[PDB]
Amino acid sequence: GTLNRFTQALVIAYVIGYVFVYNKGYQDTDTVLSSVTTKVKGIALTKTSELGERIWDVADYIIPPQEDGSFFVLTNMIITTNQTQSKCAENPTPASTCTSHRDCKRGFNDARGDGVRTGRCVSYSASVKTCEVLSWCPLEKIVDPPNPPLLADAERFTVLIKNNIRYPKFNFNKRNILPNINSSYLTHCVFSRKTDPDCPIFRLGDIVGEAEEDFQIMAVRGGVMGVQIRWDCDLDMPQSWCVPRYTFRRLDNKDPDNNVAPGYNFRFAKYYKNSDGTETRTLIKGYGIRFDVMVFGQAGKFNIIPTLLNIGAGLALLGLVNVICDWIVL
Amino acid sequence: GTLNRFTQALVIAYVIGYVFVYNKGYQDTDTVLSSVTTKVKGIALTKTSELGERIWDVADYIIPPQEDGSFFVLTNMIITTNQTQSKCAENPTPASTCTSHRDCKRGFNDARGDGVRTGRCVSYSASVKTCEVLSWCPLEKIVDPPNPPLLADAERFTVLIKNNIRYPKFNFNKRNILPNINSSYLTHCVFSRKTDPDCPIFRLGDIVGEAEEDFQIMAVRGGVMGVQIRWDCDLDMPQSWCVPRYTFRRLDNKDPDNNVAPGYNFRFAKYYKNSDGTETRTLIKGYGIRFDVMVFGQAGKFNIIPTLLNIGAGLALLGLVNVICDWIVL
Amino acid sequence: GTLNRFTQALVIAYVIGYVFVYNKGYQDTDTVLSSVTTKVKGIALTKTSELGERIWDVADYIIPPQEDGSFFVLTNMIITTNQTQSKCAENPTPASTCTSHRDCKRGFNDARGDGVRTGRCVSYSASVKTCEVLSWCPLEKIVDPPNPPLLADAERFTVLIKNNIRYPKFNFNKRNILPNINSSYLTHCVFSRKTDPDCPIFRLGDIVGEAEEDFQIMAVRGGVMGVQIRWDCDLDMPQSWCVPRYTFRRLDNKDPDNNVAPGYNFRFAKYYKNSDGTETRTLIKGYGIRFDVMVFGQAGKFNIIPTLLNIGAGLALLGLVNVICDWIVL
Ligand SMILES: *[C@@H]1O[C@H](CO)[C@@H](O[C@@H]2O[C@H](CO)[C@@H](O[C@@H]3O[C@H](CO)[C@@H](O)[C@H](O[C@H]4O[C@H](CO)[C@@H](O)[C@H](O)[C@@H]4O)[C@@H]3O)[C@H](O)[C@H]2NC(C)=O)[C@H](O)[C@H]1NC(C)=O
Ligand SMILES: *[C@@H]1O[C@H](CO)[C@@H](O[C@@H]2O[C@H](CO)[C@@H](O[C@@H]3O[C@H](CO)[C@@H](O)[C@H](O[C@H]4O[C@H](CO)[C@@H](O)[C@H](O)[C@@H]4O)[C@@H]3O)[C@H](O)[C@H]2NC(C)=O)[C@H](O)[C@H]1NC(C)=O
Ligand SMILES: *[C@@H]1O[C@H](CO)[C@@H](O[C@@H]2O[C@H](CO)[C@@H](O[C@@H]3O[C@H](CO)[C@@H](O)[C@H](O[C@H]4O[C@H](CO)[C@@H](O)[C@H](O)[C@@H]4O)[C@@H]3O)[C@H](O)[C@H]2NC(C)=O)[C@H](O)[C@H]1NC(C)=O
Ligand SMILES: *[C@@H]1O[C@H](CO)[C@@H](O)[C@H](O)[C@H]1NC(C)=O
Ligand SMILES: *[C@@H]1O[C@H](CO)[C@@H](O)[C@H](O)[C@H]1NC(C)=O
Numbered sequence: 001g002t003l004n005r006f007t008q009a010l011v012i013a014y015v016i017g018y019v020f021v022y023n024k025g026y027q028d029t030d031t032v033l034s035s036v037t038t039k040v041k042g043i044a045l046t047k048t049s050e051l052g053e054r055i056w057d058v059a060d061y062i063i064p065p066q067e068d069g070s071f072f073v074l075t076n077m078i079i080t081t082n083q084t085q086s087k088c089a090e091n092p093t094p095a096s097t098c099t100s101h102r103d104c105k106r107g108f109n110d111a112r113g114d115g116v117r118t119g120r121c122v123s124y125s126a127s128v129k130t131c132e133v134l135s136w137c138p139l140e141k142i143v144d145p146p147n148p149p150l151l152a153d154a155e156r157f158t159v160l161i162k163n164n165i166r167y168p169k170f171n172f173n174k175r176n177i178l179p180n181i182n183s184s185y186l187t188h189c190v191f192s193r194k195t196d197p198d199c200p201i202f203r204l205g206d207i208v209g210e211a212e213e214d215f216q217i218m219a220v221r222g223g224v225m226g227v228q229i230r231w232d233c234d235l236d237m238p239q240s241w242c243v244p245r246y247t248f249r250r251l252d253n254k255d256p257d258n259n260v261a262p263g264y265n266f267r268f269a270k271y272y273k274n275s276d277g278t279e280t281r282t283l284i285k286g287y288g289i290r291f292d293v294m295v296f297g298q299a300g301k302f303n304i305i306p307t308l309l310n311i312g313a314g315l316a317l318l319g320l321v322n323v324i325c326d327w328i329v330l
Numbered sequence: 331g332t333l334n335r336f337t338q339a340l341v342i343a344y345v346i347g348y349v350f351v352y353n354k355g356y357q358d359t360d361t362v363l364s365s366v367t368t369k370v371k372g373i374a375l376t377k378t379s380e381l382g383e384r385i386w387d388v389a390d391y392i393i394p395p396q397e398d399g400s401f402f403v404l405t406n407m408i409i410t411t412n413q414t415q416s417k418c419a420e421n422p423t424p425a426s427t428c429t430s431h432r433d434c435k436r437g438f439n440d441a442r443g444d445g446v447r448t449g450r451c452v453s454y455s456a457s458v459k460t461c462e463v464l465s466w467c468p469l470e471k472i473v474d475p476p477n478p479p480l481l482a483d484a485e486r487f488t489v490l491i492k493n494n495i496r497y498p499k500f501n502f503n504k505r506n507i508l509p510n511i512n513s514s515y516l517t518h519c520v521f522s523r524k525t526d527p528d529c530p531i532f533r534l535g536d537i538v539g540e541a542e543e544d545f546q547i548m549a550v551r552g553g554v555m556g557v558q559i560r561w562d563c564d565l566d567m568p569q570s571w572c573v574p575r576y577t578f579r580r581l582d583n584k585d586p587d588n589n590v591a592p593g594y595n596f597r598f599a600k601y602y603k604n605s606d607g608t609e610t611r612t613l614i615k616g617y618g619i620r621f622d623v624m625v626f627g628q629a630g631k632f633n634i635i636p637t638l639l640n641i642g643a644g645l646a647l648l649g650l651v652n653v654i655c656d657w658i659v660l
Numbered sequence: 661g662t663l664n665r666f667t668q669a670l671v672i673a674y675v676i677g678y679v680f681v682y683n684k685g686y687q688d689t690d691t692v693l694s695s696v697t698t699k700v701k702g703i704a705l706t707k708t709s710e711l712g713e714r715i716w717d718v719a720d721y722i723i724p725p726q727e728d729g730s731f732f733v734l735t736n737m738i739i740t741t742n743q744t745q746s747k748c749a750e751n752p753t754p755a756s757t758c759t760s761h762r763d764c765k766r767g768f769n770d771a772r773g774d775g776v777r778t779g780r781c782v783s784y785s786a787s788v789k790t791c792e793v794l795s796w797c798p799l800e801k802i803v804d805p806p807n808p809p810l811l812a813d814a815e816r817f818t819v820l821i822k823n824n825i826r827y828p829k830f831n832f833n834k835r836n837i838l839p840n841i842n843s844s845y846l847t848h849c850v851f852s853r854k855t856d857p858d859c860p861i862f863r864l865g866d867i868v869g870e871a872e873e874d875f876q877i878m879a880v881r882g883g884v885m886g887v888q889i890r891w892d893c894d895l896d897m898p899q900s901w902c903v904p905r906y907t908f909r910r911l912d913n914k915d916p917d918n919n920v921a922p923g924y925n926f927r928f929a930k931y932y933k934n935s936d937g938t939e940t941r942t943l944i945k946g947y948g949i950r951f952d953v954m955v956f957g958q959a960g961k962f963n964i965i966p967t968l969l970n971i972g973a974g975l976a977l978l979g980l981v982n983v984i985c986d987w988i989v990l
């Protein structure tokens with residue numbers, strides 16, 4: 001009747017429409033197993049006082065040569081050369097500057113944490129004096145990295161990203177490079193959301209940009225881009241219709257006030273032996289943008305069990321539907 | 331009756347048999363937290379014109395020394411030595427070869443993307459002329475990597491793989507090396523699907539092979555093996571019965587026509603200072619096989635809530651069972 | 661009645677109390693997408709016969725400079741210098757020691773697997789003789805790493821850990837550094853479970869320790885710490901209440917008898933060119949502690965579908981509740 005039939009049709013609408021055709025309640029799910037390969041192409045040019053006219057290619061600016069699922073691109077740096085294990089004068093810092101040996105306590109760390117103080121106080125320059133430490137010497141100088149960044153050419157760098165996934169449960173496998181697409185295209189390809197959406201080759205600047213940030217800006221102090229690949233698939237539909245979605249997100253905090261060590265930089269070195277048999281190194285403090293490819297899928301496919309489950313839920317629900325509807329009238 | 335009792339027994343069979351004892355509908359689930367360590371043992375020998383009789387050990391052929399959860403094995407290479415930052419003649423390519431300086435536009439990239447053109451056109455050889463670029467010099471030569479691959483000895487290399495997992499929800503922990511197994515065995519152990527299934531030490535060639543590929547073949551141009559470890563566990567049963575399953579899959583596309591940059595290769599370098607204080611490097615373009623250990627578990631254990639849920643679903647379902655069965659007769 | 665009303669109230673208690681307010685059956689779930697950055701600060705000092713008074717900073721002791729989501733800290737090492745590709749005498753091992761060339765079969769591997777035997781037998785020392793091999797020479801000596809470990813200063817090292825997460829389904833994002841916390845605090849901050857629970861800067865020793873292990877002990881042979889971050893969130897509640905939980909677990913087996921290659925060590929090298937144009941390297945076998953940051957969240961939020969589902973389950977269940985209760989009396 002008005003109470004029974006109406007309510008019945010209503011719950012029908014709820015399940016079929018809402019829980020089923022809408023929310024896919026008739027499906028069983030699986031999540032993604034994933035493998036990512038990246039390849040960066042490009043060259044940066046630098047001109048520098050104390051350096052020269054210089055090329056930086058993929059071996060120079062990718063560090064290390066591979067991280068599984070992510071790559072770090074060198075954008076900026078501070079470079080200290082001809083360091084050797086020795087003693088030298090600490091950089092002036094309130095705690096660094098010293099009048100005499102009383103101020104320098106041997107065996108203790110330093111403000112920077114780049115040396116160990118020999119109690120001896122030594123003169124930094126003709127004007128100053130500061131604690132002597134044992135370290136790689138001379139110490140890196142306290143300075144900000146250059147603005148604009150030395151490796152700015154990197155905005156123009158390109159990264160091929162190959163990603164293959166599989167859903168173990170459903171035995172389905174797919175590649176992020178789709179069947180239609182041909183090799184030559186992929187010689188000349190560059191990803192474009194409008195023109196070339198199926199091109200796996202992305203431009204560094206375009207990723208930053210696409211994330212509503214700017215390469216050059218972000219490139220002085222460094223930072224972290226997430227490149228998110230999403231495989232959501234209804235495996236009832238054509239395999240063809242199962243495709244990756246790319247989104248881009250800057251991961252690190254731009255707020256200088258709520259964090260520590262903003263941007264992205266790390267120290268790493270190059271070691272040489274001067275022919276004497278004596279070791280010397282070059283310390284680089286690099287900044288850049290780490291890119292994290294991040295892949296997450298979910299697939300789903302028709303299954304009796306959950307279907308029937310939901311149905312039973314509906315049937316049990318209508319019982320209460322009649323009461324709730326009845327007492328709802330006047 | 332014939333309608334009621336029969337249907338009742340039928341749905342009983344469906345739930346108990348199908349949704350429960352079959353499909354495990356009485357269980358609650360958790361997924362794996364995982365840690366992987368790998369250790370490669372072996373030595374490769376090479377003999378080469380322009381090189382010599384040479385050894386390559388783990389420090390030489392694993393690059394870099396560690397990636398979390400995966401390792402790259404060096405199989406092939408192209409090696410350019412005594413490069414220094416300088417200018418030189420580009421390699422002949424349709425765009426490379428030049429008659430005069432008009433053809434070379436200063437400040438622009440090159441076909442390879444290994445240099446920046448100074449507008450000056452310089453003669454490659456007595457016969458040819460091509461654009462001058464600033465780069466690490468001399469340039470790597472355009473050539474294919476050697477066939478058969480230099481590091482073929484790597485087929486015979488061995489990798490210990492230790493994998494420890496935990497299911498946070500169920501508090502259960504396990505190691506991929508099982509309790510029975512003893513240390514000496516693990517001195518001499520090599521994984522065998524027939525004889526030694528519980529041996530964590532796998533042979534590179536055997537992984538490739540087990541994946542229905544061939545090391546040597548795959549080793550010229552490089553590539554990617556997935557080593558898949560699966561922990562599916564019914565935590566109702568003995569902990570003893572919770573074990574890893576190993577499968578092996580080549581991840582990259584063998585089709586040359588549907589992709590870019592087939593196989594696996596990357597560039598990386600060794601930097602030296604000639605005693606003058608002058609820098610020089612050796613560029614290696616390596617090929618090899620990256621191995622991705624990929625671990626995915628699911629554990630499940632009895633829970634009242636889902637059990638009862640399913641039951642209710644059944645009871646609600648039978649109501650419709652009577653109607654559907656009745657109207658199904660004649 | 662006594663049968664009907666009582667049972668009704670009982671199942672009500674079961675669902676509302678147990679399946680709902682207790683077990684959160686009214687919620688829908690999502691799991692974590694995660695990004696981790698780590699930064700190690702500190703300096704180690706070493707004094708050694710055959711070495712000197714020496715500093716080791718972050719470039720020296722972090723290897724390689726970055727792994728995505730985990731870092732390896734150098735604690736101990738065995739160091740072999742001025743190796744060059746050449747031939748030399750193998751280390752005495754039952755299989756190593758040889759009386760004459762019959763005992764040395766050319767072209768075959770060795771016990772250590774660091775060389776290839778030229779059939780020639782050569783005298784190790786004035787006293788002994790052993791097989792000649794082609795290798796980097798001289799060979800690393802068979803010895804245990806030093807006790808106590810050279811890099812013990814590392815116990816005192818500190819690691820900033822930044823972790824940003826997002827739940828794609830619920831669009832919620834959060835950082836492991838919380839809004840209240842201010843920069844200066846994070847200059848001086850060190851994580852403390854009692855005093856400073858919201859400090860992202862952890863002390864290596866304190867992590868080991870917190871895991872009921874000891875840095876120094878674990879530091880001779882190396883090993884693996886899991887640093888587990890857990891984001892469990894009810895997204896019904898305040899975003900404020902969504903926070904990370906840190907736990908710490910040693911991942912590797914301390915049992916020497918049930919495994920292979922205990923602790924954590926790997927080989928890696930430094931390559932130099934002696935001015936002749938001749939290559940030489942330094943082989944380091946390092947030990948240390950790899951730290952794996954491991955992040956797993958689950959978020960949940962109210963949803964009609966599962967709520968109603970469970971309800972229906974309840975209603976269907978009570979039907980059986982009446983029978984089970986009735987037949988339960990006398
Ligand atoms: C191998 O596969 C490629 C896959 O791209 C394919 O060539 C492409 O064919 C399609 C269909 O004709 C075209 O794609 C684009 O479609 C948009 C509309 O959505 C147009 O606005 C695009 O304009 C292009 O203009 C130029 C086309 O040459 C490009 O310089 C520019 O980047 C735009 O893409 C474009 O038409 C298009 O024709 C190409 N895509 C491109 C960029 O080449 C083809 O089937 C196969 N290639 C061959 C020749 O075997
Ligand atoms: C420590 O644990 C090891 C675990 O392997 C164990 O030694 C093993 O015992 C079992 C049971 O007797 C044996 O395993 C194998 O079983 C298959 C049948 O499924 C046989 O066909 C195998 O044939 C072997 O032949 C040789 C055995 O020495 C091997 O050269 C060869 O690789 C095959 O494995 C084999 O019998 C077997 O006896 C060993 N496994 C091996 C290979 O050693 C033992 O309990 C413990 N070790 C000790 C001595 O404490
Ligand atoms: C920016 O945020 C910081 C966040 O810590 C905050 O300063 C802190 O304020 C709280 C609240 O007064 C204090 O936290 C601690 O609370 C526990 C009790 O649970 C106390 O036992 C702690 O004792 C501290 O003693 C010293 C405090 O200076 C520390 O040396 C020691 O490590 C303990 O933390 C402590 O009171 C505390 O006052 C600080 N936390 C610390 C350690 O600084 C403040 O709101 C903001 N900072 C500023 C000044 O803007
Ligand atoms: C390296 O050791 C060699 C022998 O292999 C020795 O002749 C030479 O002196 C060493 N070079 C240096 C810098 O000590
Ligand atoms: C390195 O600097 C040292 C002082 O530490 C200096 O004496 C020497 O000239 C330098 N070596 C080179 C190659 O310039």
Ligand SMILES: *[C@@H]1O[C@H](CO)[C@@H](O)[C@H](O)[C@H]1NC(C)=O
Nearest residue numbers: 412414467468935936937938
């Ligand atoms: C390196 O090559 C240069 C030319 O760029 C050459 O003059 C020099 O001999 C080489 N150095 C060595 C050690 O052979």
Ligand SMILES: [Gd]
Nearest residue numbers: 155214215216
């Ligand atoms: Gd710009």
Ligand SMILES: [Gd]
Nearest residue numbers: 485544545546
């Ligand atoms: Gd073969």
Ligand SMILES: [Gd]
Nearest residue numbers: 815874875876
């Ligand atoms: Gd201690």
